[PDB]
Write a protein that binds this DNA or RNA. Sequence first.
DNA 1: TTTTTTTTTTTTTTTT
Lengths: 335, 280, 328, 336, 346, 330
Amino acid sequence: TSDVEERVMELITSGDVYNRLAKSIAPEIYGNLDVKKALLLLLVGGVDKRVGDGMKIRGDINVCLMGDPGVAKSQLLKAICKISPRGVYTTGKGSSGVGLTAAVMKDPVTDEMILEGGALVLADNGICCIDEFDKMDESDRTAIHEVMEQQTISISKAGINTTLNARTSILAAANPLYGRYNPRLSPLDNINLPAALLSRFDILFLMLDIPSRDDDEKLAEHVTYVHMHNKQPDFTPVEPSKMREYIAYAKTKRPVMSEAVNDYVVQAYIRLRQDSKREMDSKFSFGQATPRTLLGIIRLSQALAKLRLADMVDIDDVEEALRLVRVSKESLYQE
Amino acid sequence: MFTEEEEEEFLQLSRNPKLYEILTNSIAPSIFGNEDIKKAIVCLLMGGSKKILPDGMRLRGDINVLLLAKSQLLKFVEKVSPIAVYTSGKGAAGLTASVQRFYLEGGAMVLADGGVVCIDEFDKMRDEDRVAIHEAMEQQTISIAKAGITTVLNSRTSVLAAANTTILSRFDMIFIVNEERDISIANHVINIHTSEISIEKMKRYITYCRLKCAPRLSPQAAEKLSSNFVTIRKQLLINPITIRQLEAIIRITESLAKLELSPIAQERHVDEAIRLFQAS
Amino acid sequence: DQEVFLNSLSSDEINELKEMVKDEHIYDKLVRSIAPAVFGHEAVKKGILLQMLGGVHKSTVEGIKLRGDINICVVGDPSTSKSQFLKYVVGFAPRSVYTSGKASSAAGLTAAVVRDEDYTIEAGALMLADNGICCIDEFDKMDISDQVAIHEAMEQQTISIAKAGIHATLNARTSILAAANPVGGRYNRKLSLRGNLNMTAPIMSRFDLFFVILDDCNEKIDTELASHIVDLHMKRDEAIEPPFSAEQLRRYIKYARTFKPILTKEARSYLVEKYKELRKDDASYRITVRQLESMIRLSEAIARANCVDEITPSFIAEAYDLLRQSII
Amino acid sequence: ARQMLTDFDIRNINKLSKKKDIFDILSQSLAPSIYGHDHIKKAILLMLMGGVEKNLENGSHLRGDINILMVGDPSTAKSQLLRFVLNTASLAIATTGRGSSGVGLTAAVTTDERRLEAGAMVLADRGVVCIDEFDKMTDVDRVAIHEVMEQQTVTIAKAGIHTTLNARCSVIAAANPVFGQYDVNRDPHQNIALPDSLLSRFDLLFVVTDDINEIRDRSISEHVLRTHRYLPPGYLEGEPVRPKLVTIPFLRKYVQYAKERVIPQLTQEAINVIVKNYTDLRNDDNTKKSPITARTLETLIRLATAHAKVRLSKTVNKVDAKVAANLLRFALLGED
Amino acid sequence: FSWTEEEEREFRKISRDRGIIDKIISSMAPSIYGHRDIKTAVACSLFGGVPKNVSIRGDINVLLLGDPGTAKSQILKYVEKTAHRAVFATGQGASAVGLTASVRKDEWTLEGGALVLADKGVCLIDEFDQDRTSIHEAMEQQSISISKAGIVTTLQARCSIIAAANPNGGRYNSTLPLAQNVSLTEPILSRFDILCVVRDLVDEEADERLATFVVDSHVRSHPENLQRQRKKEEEISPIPQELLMKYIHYARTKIYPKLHQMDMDKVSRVYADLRRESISTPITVRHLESILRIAESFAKMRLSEFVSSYDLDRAIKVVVDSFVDAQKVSVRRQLRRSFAIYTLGH
Amino acid sequence: QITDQDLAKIREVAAREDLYSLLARSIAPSIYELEDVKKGILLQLFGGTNKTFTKGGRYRGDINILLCGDPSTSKSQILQYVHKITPRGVYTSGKGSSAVGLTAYITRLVLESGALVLSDGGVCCIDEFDKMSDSTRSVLHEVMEQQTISIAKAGIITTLNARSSILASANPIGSRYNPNLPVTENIDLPPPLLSRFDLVYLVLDKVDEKNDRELAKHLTNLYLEDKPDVLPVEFLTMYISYAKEHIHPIITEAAKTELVRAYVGMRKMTATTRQLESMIRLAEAHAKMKLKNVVELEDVQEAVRLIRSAIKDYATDPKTGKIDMNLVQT
DNA sequence: TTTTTTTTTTTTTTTT
Ligand SMILES: Nc1ncnc2c1ncn2[C@@H]1O[C@H](COP(=O)(O)OP(=O)(O)NP(=O)(O)O)[C@@H](O)[C@H]1O
Ligand SMILES: Nc1ncnc2c1ncn2[C@@H]1O[C@H](COP(=O)(O)OP(=O)(O)NP(=O)(O)O)[C@@H](O)[C@H]1O
Ligand SMILES: [Mg+2]
Ligand SMILES: [Mg+2]
Ligand SMILES: [Mg+2]
Ligand SMILES: [Mg+2]
Ligand SMILES: [Mg+2]
């Protein structure tokens, strides 16, 4: 409404909204700016696209944080759960793939069975935070391939034969195999996700807890402040209800592509698949790049074009979208 | 329940200077030899003493023993005790505690209380397996947090075991091991078909001790035991025995004084205690 | 009884039967006539026929019952028409009933405890088809808790209800025709039949005939077989050409069921020797005493197929041969 | 159980808190029947005081509660010392590793239309949970504990039930190493089967061991033999039942007063010692009993806040931080 | 069923040291060849021992293992037709409720199951888990207990049990001990008064001798075939099957045999001897009471109230060799080399 | 219902030389290449002929298809296209289903239809078939082979008519196709079920920059407008529904020589008896699609060629059963 | 104020 616009115009004209918004996600957590700069794109999302030829493609963005223990994976999932207008939390061990997806209840009365939506149904037009995704049983984890790409759900049990509309975004969190990342093994041996599941993530941040005499001093000087005061240490954020009032405006803008940008994202996909062809050398392999990842660049670049409130995507938004996919992997290579 | 017309006989047993051996002679009496074995059954019938300390700590009064036709001793135990239970784990109810449909079951450890449970190939017993006996037999306690069930189950009871690793931790002492016997035994069976004390006295005597006496170590018994336990550890070091065993010695030393109805234990008891323990 | 049936037929129904009873080649024509859509496997076809003719189900002076039924299992590597037999037989025999071994239960196959105005017993397949053919498809996929529901009730006959307070018992005189794949999905020529099929050995021991099928690679067979399959799709039921029509054939089978064949002393004297050969050739697992009784049964059924009141050693040679072939 | 305080008892608690080495008076008065594990009993006292739970205005939670694991040789009072904490915490729930399944340990759905049933960690929601033989849990059970120890809420998504339950307990746990006895000639991650993600949740990891030494074994043996000579005050020789130390009902009153009526704020003077320790503890190369994560910084902040509670202090001072750092370095590195 | 005033006299008349026992053992399921050892037992299990009170069982329980198609299954079905009362319970076909007891409205009540329809006579059962554990409770003293519908009570059984087993989910096997061929706990196996195992030893001239017998029974059983029935009893038993349902009963129910203590010293001398070499590479009072039960049983079998030494020799024979099967491949020859003067060294 | 003007359009279209490619590119316009996958799923919509023998059994045009392949290859999206186009049907997944709910449920005592029985006379689409339990896969054997279900449970002992063509989507045992393992060990379905399908596809994500220059330049091209030759679907579904009931192709004797010769040439090299029964049903579907009442050599050649291409049989080594990745699309 | 299978899906602990 025009009174909402009389608020967000102060933020827009104050400027640099993309970096302010990303820093404002969990000011309680130090650093991880590149990762906040991705989880923010998971709030605005890309564009859902029906084709007049009867096909439809996903607008929800999926993101994976893979990393060492005690790095604020979970502390950060629980923040997006409060910031988003509709998010829900869940965990790997506490969850059946059934109660995560939807379930057939036997005897509520009269011994006749009925269908009840799981956490991914509640996350209708919202978020599901799947915490400790590693410790989920593979028969339970393979239940989400169905929802991460094709949007819908389907069930055929005990006289109930049904679909559920179930449109939702996934924010998973996990630790590598053997509890912490091991440089002796490949990135894939550490990640330990099957390739069709890995394919469904628009980004995999490989975030790591490498010690440093400077960087751990900078961390503790922040964190001790947040115990000495409830405040963040030192910049000023936007409060959640003002953030939602911006993001829910941005989510309306449906930014279309343009030809000189299409021509550029094509070249970037060839270079990524050529790299995947040559760099199957285990110490460097993140698996093979695929058409789901081309759509990953499209969605991540449309999300950036919403946040700047654009009419159409521009090349300045593609060179940034490619950066997040890069920096995710480079967090290992930089060591 | 005892009165003046009955307990003065228990004062007469308590006076006799060969008392302990009179009990060995009257335990599974058909089974020849086996002297230190029958002695252990006695001490398990007598027990040490329960204590509750000023800091809320509790100290276990119950002995446990490991044995290696001797089934007749464990059978005889489910006769002579004030309270007892005989099972290998034939059960098929679990020995310890086990979960069903959810709801609980108390096993033979739970079902025994004061008194005794006795178990014949404790080796081949694996019916709610050895992990559950480590709590049950050491702690007097079985614990469960399964299928929304939460409870503590008491298990305030003695264990006698026979067998044939881990459970040599939990058992306090260890022991092992003619034909004319068989001819007499068969003649007993045939005659169904076609000192000299007994259960009638001995069960009632045991419960009278159990209720009316709970000894303390004299200071001079502590001097003997402390000096002994480090002498054991010095030899063990230069060539394990640990406080888990030292406490067992103490329990034994109490039960050996308890037989006399003596209010205090002395070198007299310590010497048969550490001697019986050296039969490890 | 034969008189009741021969009073039931008309003179013109009998005058058709009269000539096929007269004919010499009749037993080889009957075998050629079963399941006309299936090519080769004459041994199987011959098996099925002898099942429909049954044996003399009989009881000793000792009150024990000696079984007359014949139990056929067809085991095979895939795409070999083991199912086409079952579907032919259900579509032909009197009191037939078909059943998948997967989509079925220990109740639905035997006796079911149910309720109506208190508890009551309902029929499963072995009740809706005594004096008839109980097919069992996919028997290898049957629940192990339920393969044993049949073990109960083939050597010992006698379904025995001891549950839901309704202690009760049923005769269930019935003949099983059971298809299966070998485990892993193709026949492991190198294994025993045990472990080619995972079943309970006692259940396997009291089957009369295991026709193992192999997809024989021979080109002179497959050039014919392919032409046979294309002819069925090209010109349908004009391409099948049996010696007898099904309604002509059932009159013969129903007639033959009314003889009760008898052993010659030659036939006895031959049978003991054919048991010796079988047993010597396992020097144990598939030649128990049950295979003797099966050989009697089969010789009676052949004698019925010939419409003869007495067992000729010729038929025992013919019965023994089916048992030999079953070994592969 | 709950104590009721009075104007007399509150005088005695306040005047006692003035004493120069009060943390040593109280830590010796826990389980005095248990000999010489002095540094374990010090950490238990801080576990009973807890810390300070912070919740930020954006809903972001910060844990307030100590968790302890002690791992060791057989027959070491490692078990016996849990069996004591259970009888001196205000609210305590007992369990063991094999005595547990991860659902019965946390929460389990039940058919009643269906309900969620509270498990052992959802009980004790402001108390303590004691786990013995922790190592005998399967990893399929130990994944249940991972959710609770940092986030302090159980959450379920089974059979159409979806919920969070609060679970703000402290855990104290005990274990054997893989080899029965601790193999001191081998690395800790090879003696201890547990993953770094679980060892990162325990604030203090006490490796405790039997070691044969004449004066040690003597002094212990004398301790227990004195113990086995106790008399309940009204009883007599051979009749069955039925340098200061505080009497434990007073200790429990002290813990209750401190846990209710003081909420320490960090001085920057303490923060400099917390930071100096965290950065050098994590960056020096000497082998630790478990890897030093960014959870360990929080352990220092909580142990110093818990000691300031023992000291009945409105502010955490350099003295508290120095005791917290010495206790943490004893646990993670080795004896001083 | 039962005998009458002429048959009374006939019984003590046909009672003869000329093998009245033997004509009985020969007569168990006459249409099964060989396997006289199993016939020996089934005779004892029919005739039973005598129970004595204070706790001694008279019932003689038996188990039949074997390598299949061996007429263990059918010798049970012969007993249902031969014992006075006896109940046949297919081992897969029963609920544990159906073995035990069940509850229904009339107002509310209880009624009994298969182990309650058994009473001194013989339960017939097969196919060796809570079902199985009910037998583990019933073995000790012949009584169930229940707590259903708040009705805390016993129910008596006091019955013998005949049991058949297929071992191993397959063949029987000589390698390993008998104890291992079946999923049965040793208390079971101690309390069975005999265990028998049957093998397919493929001797060609034994096989010949089945088949002669078998096919002849097929002739004899053909509906082509009242008085010719009298020739068609055909002496396949020496005792008319018609009489055994009387003889059994008249032993059981007129004779309650008793043991001549003068000779019982030999039983004790033997029991020690047997224990000595069993222990040289395990034998119990349950193996002694088996000798004592079966010996009373055989006096029932020669219609005598006063047990005689030949019953003890027959009984010793039945019980001794059954031990020889445990461990068999290693042990047996060693056992035979001692045992041969006892089992059959008459 | 078809009017004289509608029939005139249908008869005009059937006379075109591009027809088989025109229909194939028109069943799913937004999918790039995959021409042999479209060309076989087109034939599944028409199906073969359906035949009753007065005695000797029943046989049917229900072609079963398995899309097996590595992820992000449009297996699940072709499955969406078919489910929208089929005149009746179901879409489901291998985790979403139970054996009961896939077939029929004992309700109240009464029977309720599960997914296949809800979906006779049209395509049943199973996605994620690889993730399905062996118990649920073990129910498919009779209902693919005999077009029917048989039940024997409490009260109900019965058959059901179940004339469903299955379209299955699957993913290999290691989640991306493994060229070190042989093709049968990638697919990892049991042979009695793998043999049940009429067409088996490998779709493979082979990197080829001269191809991916076109795929990305196609796929991103959708995003140039917000709501962005071929037949209109309205007419295409009509042409299929005419040909499904007004055309029934019979086998010419000139087609038999080839059907036999081809089967012998395959079975020499396994090509079990169901390969011939599938060649018949596809060769009927191709003539049916082209509006012919007779099957000919030109049709049997495509029914063969399409089977050789679908499994990449020309790229599979003649021994070992491994595949040479250089030969795949050259 | 008290129970029996048999068919079904989802949860939970128990055994090779
Ligand atoms: N001060 C003490 N120091 C050492 N041991 C003691 C002490 N006081 C009592 N104990 C004794 O030794 C045991 C203490 O060890 P405890 O904690 O119970 O076993 P644990 O170390 O957990 N061993 P375990 O259960 O076998 O792994 C008790 O059983 C007592 O017998
Ligand atoms: N010695 C024998 N004399 C006569 N018939 C025999 C003999 N041994 C076996 N049989 C026959 O072989 C079969 C034995 O069947 P059965 O008694 O059911 O075998 P079983 O092995 O005991 N069966 P089972 O317990 O189910 O495995 C019957 O057909 C008998 O007639
Ligand atoms: Mg976390
Ligand atoms: Mg078939
Ligand atoms: Mg302990
Ligand atoms: Mg038998
Ligand atoms: Mg897909």
